[PDB]
């Protein structure tokens, strides 16, 4: 039984290949104690991984091992993988081949150290590394289209024609849900709320997941928000305090379309998608315009499909049919596509086994693997 593990920058989605849903979805954080321990009749650990961190975050400093898609801490990634294999899945990694995910346009040493760690410390019979947007297109039941994959660290625009990603048109924007959480923390200071600690960052993340949305027209929404309090919404804090936000609900996701709100040079996701389409040949542009597929949790705002349709319709020629596919399960779409790919009959001879790694070294992943 193969293992499909999606190590995102904000969540870990792992399970068995063949199931329709992931079995372990937990935050990718390592928490460490911050205060003085005075009681000796207690477990008294030094590192908390996953939900155990989120249940103890008020006395903990939280660290994300992945920052902007690349892995910064490898000991914490080892801890994440150990907790995934032994505590959330209850499996032995010596018996199961493991499928891994990787964002496109990434440094090669990340894949090198990933293969080295997965073959030297958590020894698997075989392993494979796949691109996330290609798997998200595979999970949607199509083989040609453009995938907008926006998660916690990166936003990617990947066009795939006949099951092959087009590497000369892959676009990368360094803006995702972590930057939106930090921008919401910055703009909640206008109403008097202070969020500083890493524990309160999770509270603001919950606020963003609960209350924010995407305005269809930004200037008209800002005009209506400044005319009456029909857009104000209330949120109850963990300590019982009640906060109210009126126009921060749609200003925070507007950084996806206006990235200069946090001071980034790149263009919005609509212009990024139009640039990724326009770098391709003319005879496939109709198929790429007709098959826009959303992916990831940052596309879960309840206004993003209509706004993206309006903006791409504005950018595209007027005789072009624009269709945007936003599946309701797109928070788990890389995992489902990996489950489809790992349960295929001819995929079983594409595994990088341990013998080829012994005969090659930590560079086989650039030749047998994409």
């Amino acid at each position: 039984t193969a293992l499909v593990c999606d190590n995102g920058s904000g969540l870990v989605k792992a399970g068995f290949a063949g199931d329709d849903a992931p079995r372990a979805v937990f935050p990718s954080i390592v928490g460490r104690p911050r205060h003085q321990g005075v009681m000796v009749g207690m477990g008294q650990k030094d590192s908390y991984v996953g939900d155990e961190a989120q249940s103890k975050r008020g006395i903990l400093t939280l660290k994300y091992p992945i920052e902007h898609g690349i892995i910064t801490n490898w000991d914490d990634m080892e801890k994440i993988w150990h907790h995934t294999f032994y505590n959330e899945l209850r499996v032995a990694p010596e018996e199961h081949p493991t499928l891994l995910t990787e964002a496109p346009l990434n440094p090669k040493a990340n894949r090198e150290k990933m293969t080295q760690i997965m073959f030297e410390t958590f020894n698997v019979p075989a392993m494979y590394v796949a691109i996330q947007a290609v798997l998200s297109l595979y999970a949607s039941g199509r083989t040609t289209g453009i995938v907008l994959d926006s998660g916690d660290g990166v936003t990617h625009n990947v066009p795939i024609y006949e099951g092959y990603a087009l590497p000369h048109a892959i676009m990368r924007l360094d803006l995702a849900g972590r930057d939106l959480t930090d921008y919401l923390m910055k703009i909640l200071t206008e109403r008097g709320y202070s969020f500083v600690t890493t524990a309160e960052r999770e509270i603001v993340r919950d606020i963003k997941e609960k209350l924010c949305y995407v305005a269809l027209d930004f200037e008209n929404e800002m005009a209506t928000a400044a005319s009456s309090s029909s857009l104000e919404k209330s949120y109850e804090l963990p300590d019982g305090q009640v906060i109210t936000i009126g126009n921060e609900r749609f200003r925070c996701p507007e950084t996806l379309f206006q990235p200069s709100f946090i001071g980034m040079e790149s263009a919005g996701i609509h212009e990024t998608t139009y640039n990724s389409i326009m770098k391709c040949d003319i005879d496939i542009r109709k198929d790429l315009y007709a098959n826009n597929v959303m992916s990831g949790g940052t596309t879960m705002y309840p206004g993003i499909a209509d706004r993206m349709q309006k903006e791409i319709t504005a950018l595209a020629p007027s005789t072009m049919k624009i269709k945007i596919i936003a599946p309701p399960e797109r928070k788990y779409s890389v995992w489902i596509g990996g489950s489809i790919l790992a349960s295929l009959s001819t995929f079983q001879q594409m595994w990088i086994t341990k013998q080829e790694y012994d005969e090659a070294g930590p560079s086989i992943v650039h030749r047998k693997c994409f």
Binding site: S260, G263, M264, E265
Partner: protein, 93 residues
Amino acid sequence: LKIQVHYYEDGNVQLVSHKDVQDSLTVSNEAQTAKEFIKIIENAENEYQTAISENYQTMSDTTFKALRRQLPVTRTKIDWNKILSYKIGKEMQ
């Protein structure tokens, strides 16, 4: 080495480039000096193409920024109701 590219879909863009490469080789029988000629041709043209690609990588931060920046140094759009607030800050030496 010369490259010329024209692309004119909705507007117009042209690229002209050339490079002069001087090196030396040893002289022996015909096969070995032919292999050395092919080797220096490879090691020149590969570096020329890789340098062109790396020059395209850093266009928007080094050379295009010298003509027009993508964003101002404030990393934000211009507030058009506050033009005098931008003009006041340069009057104090």
